[PDB]
Design a binder for these strands. Sequence first.
DNA 1: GAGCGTACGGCCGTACGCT
DNA 2: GAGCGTACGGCCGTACGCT
Lengths: 473, 482, 189, 188
Amino acid sequence: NERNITSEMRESFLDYAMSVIVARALPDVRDGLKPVHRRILYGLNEQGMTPDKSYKKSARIVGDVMGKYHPHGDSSIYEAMVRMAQDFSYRYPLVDGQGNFGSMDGDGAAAMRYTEARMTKITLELLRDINKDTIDFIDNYDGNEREPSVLPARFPNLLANGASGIAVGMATNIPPHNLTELINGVLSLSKNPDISIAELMEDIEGPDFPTAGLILGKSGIRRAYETGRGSIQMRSRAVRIVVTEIPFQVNKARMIEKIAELVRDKKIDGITDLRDETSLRTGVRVVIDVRKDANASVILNNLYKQTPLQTSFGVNMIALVNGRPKLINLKEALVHYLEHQKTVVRRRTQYNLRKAKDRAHILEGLRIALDHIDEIISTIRESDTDKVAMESLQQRFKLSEKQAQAILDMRLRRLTGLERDKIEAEYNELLNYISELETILADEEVLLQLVRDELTEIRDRFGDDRRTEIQLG
Amino acid sequence: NERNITSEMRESFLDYAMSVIVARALPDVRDGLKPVHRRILYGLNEQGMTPDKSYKKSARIVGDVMGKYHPHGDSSIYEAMVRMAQDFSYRYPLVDGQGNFGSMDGDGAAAMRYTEARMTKITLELLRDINKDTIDFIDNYDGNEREPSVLPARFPNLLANGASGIAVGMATNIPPHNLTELINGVLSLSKNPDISIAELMEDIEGPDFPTAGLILGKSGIRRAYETGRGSIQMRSRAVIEERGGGRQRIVVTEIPFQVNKARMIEKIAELVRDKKIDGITDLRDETSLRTGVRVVIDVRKDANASVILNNLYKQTPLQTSFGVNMIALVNGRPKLINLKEALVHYLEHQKTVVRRRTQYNLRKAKDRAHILEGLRIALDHIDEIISTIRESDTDKVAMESLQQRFKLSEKQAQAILDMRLRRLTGLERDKIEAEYNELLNYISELETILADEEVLLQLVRDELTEIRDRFGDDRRTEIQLG
Amino acid sequence: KLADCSSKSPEECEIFLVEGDSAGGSTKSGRDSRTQAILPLRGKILNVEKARLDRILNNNEIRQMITAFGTGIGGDFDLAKARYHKIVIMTDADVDGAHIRTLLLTFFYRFMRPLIEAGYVYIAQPPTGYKGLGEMNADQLWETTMNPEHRALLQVKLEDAIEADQTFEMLMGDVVENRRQFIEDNAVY
Amino acid sequence: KLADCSSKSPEECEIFLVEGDSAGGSTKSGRDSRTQAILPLRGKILNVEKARLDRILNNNEIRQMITAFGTGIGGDFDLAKARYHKIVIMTDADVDGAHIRTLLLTFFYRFMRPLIEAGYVYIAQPPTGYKGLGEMNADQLWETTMNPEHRALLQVKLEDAIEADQTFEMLMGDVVENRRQFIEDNAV
DNA sequence: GAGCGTACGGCCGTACGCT
DNA sequence: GAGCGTACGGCCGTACGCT
């Protein structure tokens, strides 16, 4: 057999490129997660590592995720989980870590056998209603497990925590945002489908970095929200000059070493010495002793230009839409997210209705059984096999195969006085529950309001203050 | 606060030394396993990675152990698991591996995400009866899991697969043996507690390496079995063949245990290069899967191949010593043990395992018989039973009324309340009586085993004989005399 | 790192380029050591369409291949000096295997083009039921991938020089947009 | 690798020798960077009672410590040139932590004895509730292990020179049998 | 005396896109 | 330009006991 070099190159490069794109480097628009991150969170859910239970070692999590969902190096899983637990990396941290989870100076986390982890309260919201047929499950790498294709994501995580990823033919770079502003934006969009980006910007002012700092103007922000692309200038908070906030993803130690380099090589002048006075007590504090009679305003402006004291955030909003990479603007991101929420709620309601209708049918048969229990027992006792017992029960009491099966599976303890009253009470309550569920599915506006109400609750519970100041000009 | 440097040194060195000894480097006499190996095998058991089910990726087992039992680097677990799957390392391999599990030339196994593993059929025997209260379970490192302190080990693994470990103040080096010879030795010991080492050696001839080869004499073997220490000379299997044209060649078909074939050949090559050995024209590794180990050493015309071969035994790892130093954990303490001591501790372990299994089975059977007695009373008076439950407001009242009226226990009354309506059918009613009668006979059989220590001892012998007939194989290493 | 074959007749000699010591050990065990050589490579090689000559020549994995093949490079290339008449690119049927295949073909196209033209370059991957070469036992690796009596090798053929030059520049070159457009246009397959 | 303190007054300055970059990062975050320095070490150091001088002097971790302390080695040793009056051996309460403690004390006994004699060498480990330093958050690492206000440091004292010389030779020396006998005699 | 096997530390290289 | 983060490759070093 033979193969054309061109045909082979095109086929192999495409297989590699699409796999990095759809199954590695880029996040899904709906939940804002890359496969490895979704697996960590699903793993924490299945292992019951919820906020209310005690911490478990990272090795216990990593090992589970590695063996059940992610057959790649255990360090790739651990490294991704560590970042999720860093308050300087995640605007809304997804992992609640105990121990050394790394620092702003690029110091690594301790070995996974030393550190402990569990879900954050906000991660409960990413997983909320996952076992209510809200999302599609797919087979794991070996067919022995089932894993989610996407998470319900009851908060707009993609925009909230941001994203970055290098793929093939493309890359992504979405900054993080304020949760209050985002939910307000979704709520404004839910009330007006024809909303403009400019109108949305009345809610979502711009990015909001966990590391705070400043943003120079709204021009870059607007360009990025309008097109999906735009440079956003991030500036350190500086007022001898004292630095209290540095830009997002900037290594403080490397930034200080860069300033120290500029003073040694006589690139900058009018500075005696520089000291990192950062502490857990005082927070970020970088102080620079300015030389007598020299202009600190001029020195500071030069530091913004020559060092990472002022850094650009190159916005390139790429995410997976219908399993395909797409450059999305601010409105598109919120539309896909709101559409996802509507589906999650609709599917949850449809699941709850199937579950309720099925139970109501069972309780109908149990009610007939309990009303004529002396006749029921005689019928079963007379029967040689369970098949005969079932056919005879269906024929005399007009019961379904499912109802007759539930009676044969009924324990003798269900024959007590209080147990019959419990069945009637459950049935009547269920009849009303079914009615309530049917009202939600009959009116698209009632369903849409339920999404709004559930989002408002998240906003009031997890919504916090803006950290990054958007400076006028 | 202050601390004496001497007190601190002694305290810290002792804590470290004990931990390496009891919880790292040395095997237990009973199952022949170090903590990491026991964990891998327990992990495979709990994850249902049995011989009859499909292979799963090595990463699933490693990750599970990492994991629930062994909070150390995942490489330590994988590396130990790899060796257990090597037929040139393990006389009776404990892991059934699919994929690249390394070679005799020291080539590593493929990444754990590519390789696949499960238990071997013989590993089922190491774990046999583990959930029948045969062995003591201990809490795992974080208290979230339970792990075995020792495995039931229905075959003498310590001696069968051997061991090696560098600890603190001591080291271990137990050679592997033949399973047939070992079980025969245990059976001879079971019949005569006062058996001599010399008598045991009529069953256990000496070590049996997976890599075959030869052993020069029985002097070293005897010394090692008598004292627990002794040097055993391992020689490669080499024959002098005719090339043609009056020329000769040495052909190596078996090499000593734990000798790297590639490094051995590189040593021969180094000596011919440095002129430290003469009469060798060529040296090539003609090893294949189909033909097995084959190392050809071309000998120069008119030069004596017998002299060249004898020099190779002296100057290269073609002849290597196995320094026997049989150290194992006895009652959680390191001990230098001879051949008899090793078999005594193993036989004692087997007697306990079977006694405890029988005692467990009896408790389990007696408990079930009690439940069936209650169900039989319930089915004989079912119309009465139903009336009692119907008249009761809560389950507590229903239970108290059933116990008082029909002289039932709390357990019996509970089983009746938990009884499904399906169980009142003709076939289900007969199933209960049939189970009860069969159980009565089973209890009698169990009680017969526990009443006579000789019947129990014979059961150990019979169970060991079954293992021997099933997994016992031919001797590979020739013990030359010597 | 090369595990050479006993035969010195290039016509009958074959070399298998395997990813890592992870496939090296098993192929070294499974091969016919008389006519089959193994060159284990340390993962992804340099993209020679992007990299400059000085960086390429200082790369150990690139050097090892040049040394093993004998031939030489570009202008100093000699097909008559080729130590093997079969150079098999052995990769896994996965994301990383696919990339390794493209990087190796790129090296062969830019530095050893007459080797492809002579029909010496071949492609092999695990048979169906296997995704990676590390999943296979040496006997199966032999019987399905290495045994000339019943194996599945694909001979790499150069049909159109202009189309190939364009393909290698589009897929492996510095211009991301051409690659992005190709991905966008062929994503369905 | 050393994360030095701002102060240059040795009497008030302290150095914490931590096992790995795994404890380095958290202690660097939790410390009072004014008077506390951190020297992260790359695991188990050389056993100086077994190793020869040429091997010891070429070891980059041994070199790092000598450089950081600023005292020098034997022939050029000077206690007045000590850059810190507190050298804190920070290890975990486990098998590997215990060994690291013994190897470090062996180095200080054979090459920097007056440092122990001056009461500059201290021992710290995690408080009860933790086994390893990597389990702790930087704030707890500060509040329980580094905060001079409320910490648990053990000052290493040299009480009997003959007994210490014998202890270090028995436990860390070339003769395995003396160590084996000690283990056998003191096993619990 | 470099290697064995349990444990632990480190360092370096490759692609990929954007700035 | 050299980082970022997902993936993958390699290379060393320490103790410990006995050859």
